[PDB]
Amino acid sequence: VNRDTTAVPYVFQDDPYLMPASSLESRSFLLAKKSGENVAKFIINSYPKYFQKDIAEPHIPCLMPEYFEPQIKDISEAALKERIELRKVKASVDMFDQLLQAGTTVSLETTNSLLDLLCYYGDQEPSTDYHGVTWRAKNNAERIFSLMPEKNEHSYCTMIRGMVKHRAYEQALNLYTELLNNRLHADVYTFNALIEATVCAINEKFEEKWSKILELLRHMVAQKVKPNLQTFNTILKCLRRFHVFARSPALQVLREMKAIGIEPSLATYHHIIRLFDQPGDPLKRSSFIIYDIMNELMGKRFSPKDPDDDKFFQSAMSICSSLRDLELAYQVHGLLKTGDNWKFIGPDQHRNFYYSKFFDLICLMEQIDVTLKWYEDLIPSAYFPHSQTMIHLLQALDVANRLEVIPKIWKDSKEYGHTFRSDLREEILMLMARDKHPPELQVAFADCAADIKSAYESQPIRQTAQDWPATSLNCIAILFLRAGRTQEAWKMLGLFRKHNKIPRSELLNELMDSAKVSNSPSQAIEVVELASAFSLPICEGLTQRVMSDFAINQEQKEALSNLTALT
Amino acid sequence: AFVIPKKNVPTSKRETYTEDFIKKQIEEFNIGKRHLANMMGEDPETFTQEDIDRAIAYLFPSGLFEKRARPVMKHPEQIFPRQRAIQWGEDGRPFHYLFYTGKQSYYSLMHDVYGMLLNLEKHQVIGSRWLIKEELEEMLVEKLSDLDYMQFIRLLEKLLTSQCGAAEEEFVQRFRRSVTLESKKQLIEPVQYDEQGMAFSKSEGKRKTAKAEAIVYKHGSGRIKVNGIDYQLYFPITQDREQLMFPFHFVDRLGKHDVTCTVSGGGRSAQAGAIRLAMAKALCSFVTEDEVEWMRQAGLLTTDPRVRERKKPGQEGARRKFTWKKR
Amino acid sequence: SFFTKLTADELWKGALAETGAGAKKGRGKRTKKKKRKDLNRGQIIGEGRYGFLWPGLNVPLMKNGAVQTIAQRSKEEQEKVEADMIQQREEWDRKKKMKVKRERGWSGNSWGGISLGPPDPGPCGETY
């Protein structure tokens, strides 16, 4: 089975009233459903006795209540280990202090397991359902560490990693000195954190920072520690600041990974892609970095190795739009469609950005016959479009001279939450009313202009004074005339005076042609009366046209004389 | 002025389907017909109504005993009830000169028939029946009384008795519906041949819960085997043997055929009855057509439908009631 | 027992006793009559005594661009909500109690002389 293009994603309820009609509702409907699940879990865990009857065979461990409270109330080592597994930072500290004051022995492995808990969360309680630098200067972690009687390599490693995680870069480097003075050897994970601290500890020039890092790496070789993927990925992520200076140094890290045997992941290329994608002219370098990165990744299935693997596709598509290369965008999307690579697209924010830049590049550089195939396959099945892509789509129809599709884009726009977007309705009306068309098309444009008129009239900003742009009023009126709905056009002329919007020259000239056909002198004067209010120069010349073209009754002649008096 | 509660909701009334509605229902049926054909992997062009009904029964299996309540996807013509068209134009003038009778179609028909009877004067069964009132009420698209139906029929019969010509005969046949007469002639079993080449026929019979299957051989000495036993040993009751005799005796063929039959279920009498019916049906292959009609008229080829009636709750038996307690 | 509970419609049909030999022949008269009340009228889905605030049900889902978390009203903040619902309930009872008096006829208990308004508009857009 393949994706159903007429449907919204499977997570949503397949019902027209419950299906999301916009990108905003796409996000909020899922958050509302997740909120309901959390409320259920909150109740299940608060009142577990109601959910303890197990009638399932085989047993379902994942459908039973969870107990987050310690059941050992004795004061001993084996009771502390329980509070460490539950991640009770305060209870574990209190239990550790009391246990220490009593003078009982607490093992080293357990003392370390307490630091891993404090050093990770920063002596703060993890979030629960319901009841700057964050390395608190007064922190239980540092105290317990000092009081510690015997300290092994693992004790320092968890202290150094926790400081870097909480942005205590300077303290972590100072602690790395003691570890060396004490003839101890750190692990790869500790070195990864120290590389991040070397770059973020102080602001200096690249050459100074690039010399310390190479010293950490050589130290890592002296201590017989082998670098992992995160070691090289942290270097590239930290070199993002220096940009042009780090472009060639960054490529030296990648070539080293290949030789050593570490395999670059999606994150390794995301960091390189972001480093080279600096504001400027990308053609000089960014062109051949992305072309070579995709030939390498061509036909490769990816597995999760780094937390930043879900950012490559969003980064890669961003450059294809900048370069305006559609063949490269197809290769990037091709990589996303091989095997299970579609799961690396990222969160909803990254999924919508990827498809926005991807579709906006299709409308621009692709034939309109194929563009409408992607429009049907991607929207709304894959993502809900932003109002700026609907415009990029109309600009594509214009360039292709296929304007019979404009009424469809308006119907779709409403179904995607763009009914009351001003930039969009103005764009649609201007294209429809830009030039005259065969009678069949002109009639269709008047059915849409009517529906747009209704949107302007029934806006949800109706509480505020209705904003009727001048272009919208001129276009909607012109479309009625060219369609033969003259009655509707004449009625709208009042709205030019009510909202004080200047009438367009073209609209006034076409109104005369509708009058000379109906041979109505009063209406023709109503046109000259309107242009006279705004003091348009064409009016004085139009009054001459009205005289000759239409029979002027004595009352009408005096009315023109009254406007002539104004002249 | 003051307020009285409103009497009722107008929607609480019989609906009506406008011509435009049916026109759009047919566009949906034709698009859905192509969808259903695409679902089943069949050619949409050669997709018939029998295919639609079969596909709907598979995709939407319903066991409801009443077929009218089961899923259906039919052409709107079949589904929606036929609707009488407007009986006047924009100016309000009725189209038919008999509009104000309220039965213009019925009285226009009576008017046409009465006029034909007059012109004749100026000029001068087995396979067909008259249409029923419910069929006349559809040709006219109006509601009719029972006496309205009779008066129309009495007037058509008065038209047959006259010297009606060809023009006056096509008209009457519009109201004659052919009555199909079922053939009561007994179906003859095929004559088969065994390994030894002896001609025989085979049939079946049912009496109550007894079911019998009999093999009657064209030639024989009068031997009858019932479950491998001689009939007089299997049927020690003389009345059960008289039942076996009846088919052969009635056609004067005692001692001319051999029979081997198997019977299960029921009691001794019910089993003899089932064998009687099975032997008679098989024996019909070896007698003349006139003899088969005589066996039919003697009740020898009719399955007895008399079976035990269920007991009902609240009474002692199928019919007997509990004693009506003394008052 | 939870399984012995019925719907509101069942409970009112029984309590009101509008079908029965009492109401068939007006054998029972009603100076004091049980009056049907809709008890789901002013009730909000998600609102309970404990005063929990469920994001997306009874409070907004997102606040300041971030998803709200489960919260509970303070004991004082919940008393105000309960009191406000009682006052809103008495206000509704008083709005129904405030009904415009209609003028009487020839006498206070007589129908004669009372206006019934204009005749109803005929089917063909006729008005009186």
Partner: peptide, 16 residues
């Protein structure tokens, strides 16, 4: 009766 008898639109996709 004399006491009184007082028993007493637009649609949008993705509304707000």
């Amino acid at each position: 009766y004399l006491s009184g008898e007082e028993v007493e639109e637009y649609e949008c996709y993705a509304p707000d």
